[PDB]
Amino acid sequence: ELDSLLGQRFQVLPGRDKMLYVAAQNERDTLWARQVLARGDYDKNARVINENEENKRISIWLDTYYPQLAYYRIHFDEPRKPVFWLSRQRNTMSKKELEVLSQKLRALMPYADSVNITLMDDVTAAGQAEAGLKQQALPYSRRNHKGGVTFVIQGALDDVEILRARQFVDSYYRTWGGRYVQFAIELKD
């Protein structure tokens, strides 16, 4: 526990399933801690997690049990108290349903004391997309789709402009996830 700590930018967290959960900040560290733990006696006492993998794991569960849920992403700034961003506008759940959801999520994350559900404003999510693209003089057309919006970047983009556009998009999805606003580049000329 403190034992695992000494083994190693990480937070080691006790789980209700008697597992030890090592929270890492990114991919490189996740693989490193896995390499390290596998070489010794904790090799099956610990599991290394990070925000990208845990979002993927919870999204698969929700795909079946809450298949129409309008959500963004779960954030792990404090890994003992993950915060699940849901859409305020597109939420269809009563207060009691959201409480049930929080409890199921907590059961799915044995290292978490609680899972707070925060209702986020779609106007903010789309407004950060709009602002980021404008910040790069990227013309775009916003095109609504079923339960989403696509910002379609448009123009005869060169090498660097495409990379800058895609780097912005990746940074956008790290915050909001890719389930509401999505992006595309239409190449012209």
Numbering used by the authors: 172 to 179, 183 to 363
Direct quotes from the study:
The bacterial injectisome, or type III secretion system (T3SS), is a specialized syringe-shaped protein-export system utilized by many pathogenic Gram-negative bacteria for the injection of virulence proteins (effectors) into host cells. In summary, we report the crystal structures for the cytoplasmic and periplasmic domains of PrgH and InvG, two of the main basal body components of the prototypical Salmonella SPI-1 injectisome.
It should be noted that the N-terminal RBMs of PrgH (defined in the new crystal form of PrgH170–392 reported here) and EscJ do not form the conserved oligomerization interface and appear involved in intra-domain interactions or membrane association. Collectively, the crystallographic packing interfaces we observe support and mirror the low energy interfaces generated in our modelled basal body. This would be consistent with a model whereby the soluble domains have low-affinity interaction surfaces for oligomerization, which can be captured by the high concentration in the crystallization experiment. All the reported purified domains of the T3SS basal body are monomeric in solution, showing that the membrane-embedded domains and/or the presence of additional proteins are necessary for their oligomerization.
